[PDB]
Amino acid sequence: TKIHSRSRARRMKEAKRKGRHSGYGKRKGTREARLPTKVLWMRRMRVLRRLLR
Amino acid sequence: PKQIHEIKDFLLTARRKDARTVKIKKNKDMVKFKVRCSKYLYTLCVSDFEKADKLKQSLPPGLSVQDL
Amino acid sequence: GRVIRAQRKGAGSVFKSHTHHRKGPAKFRSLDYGERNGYLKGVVSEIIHDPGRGAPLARVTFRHPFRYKHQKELFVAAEGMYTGQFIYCGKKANLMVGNVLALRSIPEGAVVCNVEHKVGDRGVFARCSGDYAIVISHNPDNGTTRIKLPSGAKKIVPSGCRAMIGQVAGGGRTEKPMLKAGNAYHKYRVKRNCWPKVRGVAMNPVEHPHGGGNHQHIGHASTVRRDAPPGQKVGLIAARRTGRL
Amino acid sequence: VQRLTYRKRHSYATKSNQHRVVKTPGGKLIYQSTKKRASGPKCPVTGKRIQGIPHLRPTEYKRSRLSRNRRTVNRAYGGVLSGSAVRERIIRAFLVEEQKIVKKVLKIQKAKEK
Amino acid sequence: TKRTKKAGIVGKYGTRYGASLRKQIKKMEVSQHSKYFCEFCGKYAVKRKAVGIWGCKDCGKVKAGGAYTLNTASAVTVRSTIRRLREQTES
RNA sequence: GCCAACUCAGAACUGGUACGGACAAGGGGAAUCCGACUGUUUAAUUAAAACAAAGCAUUGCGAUGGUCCCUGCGGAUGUUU
RNA sequence: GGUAGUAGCAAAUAUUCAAAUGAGAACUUUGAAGGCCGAAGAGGGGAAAGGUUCCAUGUGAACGGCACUUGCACAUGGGUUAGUCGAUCCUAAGGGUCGGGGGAACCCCGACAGAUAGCGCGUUUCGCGCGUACUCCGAAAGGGAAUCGGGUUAAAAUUCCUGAACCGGGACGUGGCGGUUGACGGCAACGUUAGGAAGUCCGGAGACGUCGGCGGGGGCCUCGGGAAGAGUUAUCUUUUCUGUUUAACAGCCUGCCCACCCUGGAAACGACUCAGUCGGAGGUAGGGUCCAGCGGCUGGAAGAGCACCGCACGUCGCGUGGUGUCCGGUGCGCCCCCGGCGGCCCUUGAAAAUCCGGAGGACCGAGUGCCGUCCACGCCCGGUCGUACUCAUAACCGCAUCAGGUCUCCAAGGUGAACAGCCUCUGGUCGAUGGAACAAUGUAGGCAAGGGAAGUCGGCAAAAUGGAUCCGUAACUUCGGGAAAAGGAUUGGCUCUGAGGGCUGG
RNA sequence: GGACCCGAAAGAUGGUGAACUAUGCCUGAGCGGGGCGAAGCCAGAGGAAACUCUGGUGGAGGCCCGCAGCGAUACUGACG
Numbered sequence A: 001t002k003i004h005s006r007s008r009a010r011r012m013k014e015a016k017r018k019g020r021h022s023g024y025g026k027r028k029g030t031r032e033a034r035l036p037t038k039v040l041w042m043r044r045m046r047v048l049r050r051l052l053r
Numbered sequence B: 001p002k003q004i005h006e007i008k009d010f011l012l013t014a015r016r017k018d019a020r021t022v023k024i025k026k027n028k029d030m031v032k033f034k035v036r037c038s039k040y041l042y043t044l045c046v047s048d049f050e051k052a053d054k055l056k057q058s059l060p061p062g063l064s065v066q067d068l
Numbered sequence C: 001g002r003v004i005r006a007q008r009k010g011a012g013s014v015f016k017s018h019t020h021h022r023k024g025p026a027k028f029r030s031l032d033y034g035e036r037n038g039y040l041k042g043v044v045s046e047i048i049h050d051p052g053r054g055a056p057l058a059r060v061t062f063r064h065p066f067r068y069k070h071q072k073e074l075f076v077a078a079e080g081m082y083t084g085q086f087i088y089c090g091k092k093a094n095l096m097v098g099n100v101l102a103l104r105s106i107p108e109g110a111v112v113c114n115v116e117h118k119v120g121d122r123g124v125f126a127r128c129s130g131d132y133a134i135v136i137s138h139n140p141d142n143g144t145t146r147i148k149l150p151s152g153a154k155k156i157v158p159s160g161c162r163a164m165i166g167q168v169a170g171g172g173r174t175e176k177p178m179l180k181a182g183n184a185y186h187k188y189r190v191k192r193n194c195w196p197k198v199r200g201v202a203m204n205p206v207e208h209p210h211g212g213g214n215h216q217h218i219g220h221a222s223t224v225r226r227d228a229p230p231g232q233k234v235g236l237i238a239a240r241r242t243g244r245l
Numbered sequence D: 001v002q003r004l005t006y007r008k009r010h011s012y013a014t015k016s017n018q019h020r021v022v023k024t025p026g027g028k029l030i031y032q033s034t035k036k037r038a039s040g041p042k043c044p045v046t047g048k049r050i051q052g053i054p055h056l057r058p059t060e061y062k063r064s065r066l067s068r069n070r071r072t073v074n075r076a077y078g079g080v081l082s083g084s085a086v087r088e089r090i091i092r093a094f095l096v097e098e099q100k101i102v103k104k105v106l107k108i109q110k111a112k113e114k
Numbered sequence E: 001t002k003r004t005k006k007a008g009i010v011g012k013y014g015t016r017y018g019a020s021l022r023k024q025i026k027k028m029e030v031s032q033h034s035k036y037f038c039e040f041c042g043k044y045a046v047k048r049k050a051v052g053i054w055g056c057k058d059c060g061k062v063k064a065g066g067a068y069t070l071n072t073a074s075a076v077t078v079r080s081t082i083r084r085l086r087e088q089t090e091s
Numbered sequence F: 001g002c003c004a005a006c007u008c009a010g011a012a013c014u015g016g017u018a019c020g021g022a023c024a025a026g027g028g029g030a031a032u033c034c035g036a037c038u039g040u041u042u043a044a045u046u047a048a049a050a051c052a053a054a055g056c057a058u059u060g061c062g063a064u065g066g067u068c069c070c071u072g073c074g075g076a077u078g079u080u081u
Numbered sequence G: 001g002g003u004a005g006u007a008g009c010a011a012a013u014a015u016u017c018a019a020a021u022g023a024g025a026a027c028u029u030u031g032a033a034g035g036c037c038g039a040a041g042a043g044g045g046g047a048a049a050g051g052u053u054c055c056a057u058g059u060g061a062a063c064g065g066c067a068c069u070u071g072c073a074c075a076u077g078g079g080u081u082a083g084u085c086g087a088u089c090c091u092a093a094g095g096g097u098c099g100g101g102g103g104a105a106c107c108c109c110g111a112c113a114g115a116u117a118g119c120g121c122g123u124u125u126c127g128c129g130c131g132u133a134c135u136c137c138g139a140a141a142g143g144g145a146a147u148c149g150g151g152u153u154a155a156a157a158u159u160c161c162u163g164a165a166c167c168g169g170g171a172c173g174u175g176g177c178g179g180u181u182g183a184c185g186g187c188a189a190c191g192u193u194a195g196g197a198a199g200u201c202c203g204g205a206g207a208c209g210u211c212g213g214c215g216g217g218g219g220c221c222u223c224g225g226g227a228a229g230a231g232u233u234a235u236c237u238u239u240u241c242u243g244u245u246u247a248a249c250a251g252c253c254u255g256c257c258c259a260c261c262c263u264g265g266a267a268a269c270g271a272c273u274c275a276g277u278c279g280g281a282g283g284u285a286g287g288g289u290c291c292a293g294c295g296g297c298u299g300g301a302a303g304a305g306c307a308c309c310g311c312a313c314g315u316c317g318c319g320u321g322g323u324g325u326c327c328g329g330u331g332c333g334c335c336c337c338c339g340g341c342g343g344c345c346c347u348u349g350a351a352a353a354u355c356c357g358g359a360g361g362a363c364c365g366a367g368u369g370c371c372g373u374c375c376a377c378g379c380c381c382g383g384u385c386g387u388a389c390u391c392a393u394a395a396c397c398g399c400a401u402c403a404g405g406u407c408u409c410c411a412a413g414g415u416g417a418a419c420a421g422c423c424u425c426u427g428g429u430c431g432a433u434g435g436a437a438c439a440a441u442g443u444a445g446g447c448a449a450g451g452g453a454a455g456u457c458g459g460c461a462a463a464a465u466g467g468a469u470c471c472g473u474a475a476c477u478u479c480g481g482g483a484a485a486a487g488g489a490u491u492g493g494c495u496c497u498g499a500g501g502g503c504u505g506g
Numbered sequence H: 001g002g003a004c005c006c007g008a009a010a011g012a013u014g015g016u017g018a019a020c021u022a023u024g025c026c027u028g029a030g031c032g033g034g035g036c037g038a039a040g041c042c043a044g045a046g047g048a049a050a051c052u053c054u055g056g057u058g059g060a061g062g063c064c065c066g067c068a069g070c071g072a073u074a075c076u077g078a079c080g
């Protein structure tokens, strides 16, 4: 099979985890499309309710 | 296919008329005895090779036996 | 020179009623000895929605008078009736909402629904949601009861005609504005192909007396003869008057 | 990324054309037809499911295909009415018969008095 | 926060159909979607299933009532009239 | 102690101020006329202010009936009121 | 005939080198290179429609708008295998009818004017009891009895081969089960492979809209470790790439979200979801029952498949042997299925065949054999027709190998909000007659100093604006909007800092 | 009278088409990613009270940008 490597993708993932390529010039979707506040609220509610329990 | 968990039940199954053939598979960790009947294939797993050999000796004379 | 829409209605085949999802006709029990002389008890098992009908319907289970089986009926629901309620049909049935009684046993001033016209016809008057008939008076000499119908007309019927006590459930439906064409589309989709309606003055002359003209206008009186032939009888048919009150 | 095709000449995604993807011992994915989801028996009085009976297609309940214990419940009206419904029916029957006896006795006593 | 000054439920219609019609339909919108007291089990669990049909989620009783309200105004009057006539007949 | 994800917000340094680097992707404002709006229309010159629409008003009719189809017999509205 | 060897052959990025064959090669085949389709494909299948176009061999002439050694052309042969996939069965809108009513009649209405088909029990084949005028056609997407891997052809396969199952029907034999004539256990939900029964009656499944959130399962995507092979290696790279599989069916286990049962009796109210909601009509809590599964283990089943490493014939052994197929993580991810809530309706979103269960108990048997038995095993059978192939920038229609039209299933990686645009992997493909030149005029696509609509009927066309983050936003208004009004600022790379979690252990 | 030959727009009679298109009915199938943020619900602040205000949650609409699908405004572009 023809070569199609994932090394560049893995390196880019590492850089993004380090915090690279995440500025205002690298964002196309809205904050909501990137990560819904509903998802964030659900996570927070689950965490806090589990702690209280 | 069905599994028999007892050597006595395996012998009872192999003694019946419709038992066509017996196949003995020799795996690394056990021995499998398979009886071909009219409706189902009955498999008995023996962990110990000594009881496996004893069963092989105890197989009825009139039943064909083959080794794998 | 073309058949008009009102004329084409009668042939049907696209103007037939849409009845695929309906639950069968709603009517009283067939009049029999038990209802004629005593009373018969049934139980309300379900209240259901009948598509194309504003009023809800009630499924009622009765014990067959002379057979070992269940007698199943579908009544036009009266307001206030509930599942598990006991319904009593007959001449001796008590005067309670939901019971079916002969008009001879219903005192004057009573509110009833699904009133029979002919004894045993199983109900033809005052069946729509929120509608009712009112018992006015009795005439024992000829055995006839007078009733006021929803339209306000007074009608004389045989005193043996049956009627359910109370008014039809679902009243006040027409008060709500629909606000949009989609609601009317949904409403008439389960009734018949009668919507939307094209105005006669918007058509060409060939297909309507109101059609034609360089301006939109009827061009002649919209009141027509009672004996005007089909295709010519459009507008306000046999109007005794027009305009505001 | 193996892409699949229908195994039959049904080319439309209807309710009766539901499939699952299964990996065969030959190392390749394949479709396998799956039966439509069916609701099990329901109690007419309470409207809730009847316990002790699996939810299968009507033909899967055939006696030759399903064991008796799997399609029977050992109680009066078992498999048809729920336990609470049966209890309610028994209590109603007993109490109504008792009240009928009471009414008959009261009528007899009134007739004797008059 | 007070999301709407006066629109309330009819805010779903935006700026369509006219203020008078929106206000007129507000009453039905509120009533048909409100919960109602159940006389059979003493709970506020009666909800409209379809026009004229009101079912209780707790005890399961289903009643025939008004198109957009559990009890129409005329229903009480009819009940009172029927009760008066029945009492007159029975006495 | 062992694992786990990409979201967010800040601070330095740095490039010929380049950086949503291709791609992707509203021009805006002040008024008049018409139609309320969404919808529909002359397949192959007209998509519109035309048609429909919710809303408003008028007319007939209680079944031995109103409207309509049919040579006739009988039918649609009507599983209706 | 002139027109005239003239008009034309120009959309869908693109071909090049070497060799083989052949009289003849830009166009056939092999290899190499350079490109495209870019998964809502130029890939892999179906429905209709076509009808042999499917596969092999060969080829004078015609045809394939240049050419051909070639082929969806021509000629000679071959090819479509079913109890399990469909039709077949059911009924939908409706269609066709008896009788009756009309009609000169062809015919019209259609169960509406009427002694219905028949159905069960025991039998001297006769008797008894039920019997509301169509037991007809109508879906290769509605409903619905049953099959799975592995292998195999030039062309067929869930149909052929092997192995292993299942469904329907028939008849008996053996064993087992009940007789307290018609089982046992659990307080209960209910459990156990069996465990009476006729007319009659009742319930359920089949069986159902749409939208939104959340949760579970299968497949895919993705990260790490072990091992096998391959790619790169002037330099670095424990790194890059590929694969590391488990079908129907049987048993056991488990028991999501719900539902249900037992103990007990609650305000200082508690429990609880993302959202709701629940509780003296019995909550929390403790303990159980049941339901789904495309969940787990075992048999099937490693003997199979795949990868790797060897020996051998070396013209025809479909030959012969070994090693591995292992252990974890992650998620508003993508496709499908399921569960449970909530929103919407003047809209409430089929029927029947068929199957299961239940109410009743007429009737029925014996003492070492009788009567029953939906239990286990054993035995036999399973018709007819379709099945090749295309499904389209040449296999259907459009007079054609026409840039048009024609229903639907599957759907990788990167960037990015994104089945947007752009690039890439599997798969496919370079098929649009070729060569030389770069005049005018055109078609399509750009740029242009200074001015900026003076052009024009008219800003037609083009240009300008555009994503995201922050600040800010007027008149008017039906108070819902206007609104992205308007108007301003920022955006790369690199190196960091802070915040936001899970499991285990008293 | 066919009436030297050829020629109408029409009229009548009897049959055939809803494989295109129009409408009703039955049964199936299909429709990214974002924006605005109505009911309902939670918490907090102000106030003497009445009551008002704020921050969250949720996800309504014949609502908006927009892919597929469906359609067809302008160039009065190409072709003609």
Ligand SMILES: [K+]
Pocket: C001, C002, C003
């Ligand atoms: K005419």
Ligand SMILES: [K+]
Pocket: C193, C194, C195, C196
């Ligand atoms: K219409």
Ligand SMILES: [K+]
Pocket: C197, C198, C199
């Ligand atoms: K109109």
Ligand SMILES: [K+]
Pocket: C201, C209, C210, C211, C212, C213, C216, C217, C218, C219
């Ligand atoms: K006119």
Ligand SMILES: [K+]
Pocket: C201, C216, C217, C218
């Ligand atoms: K006018």
Ligand SMILES: [K+]
Pocket: D051, D052, D053, D069, D070, D071, D072, D073
């Ligand atoms: K059971």
Ligand SMILES: [K+]
Pocket: F038
């Ligand atoms: K719209």
Ligand SMILES: [K+]
Pocket: none
């Ligand atoms: K419009």
Ligand SMILES: [K+]
Pocket: F047
């Ligand atoms: K338009």
Ligand SMILES: [K+]
Pocket: F051
């Ligand atoms: K109009």
Ligand SMILES: [K+]
Pocket: none
């Ligand atoms: K009539």
Ligand SMILES: [K+]
Pocket: G022, G069
């Ligand atoms: K040749």
Ligand SMILES: [K+]
Pocket: none
């Ligand atoms: K006749």
Ligand SMILES: [K+]
Pocket: G110, G111
């Ligand atoms: K008939």
Ligand SMILES: [K+]
Pocket: G139
């Ligand atoms: K079918």
Ligand SMILES: [K+]
Pocket: none
């Ligand atoms: K096989």
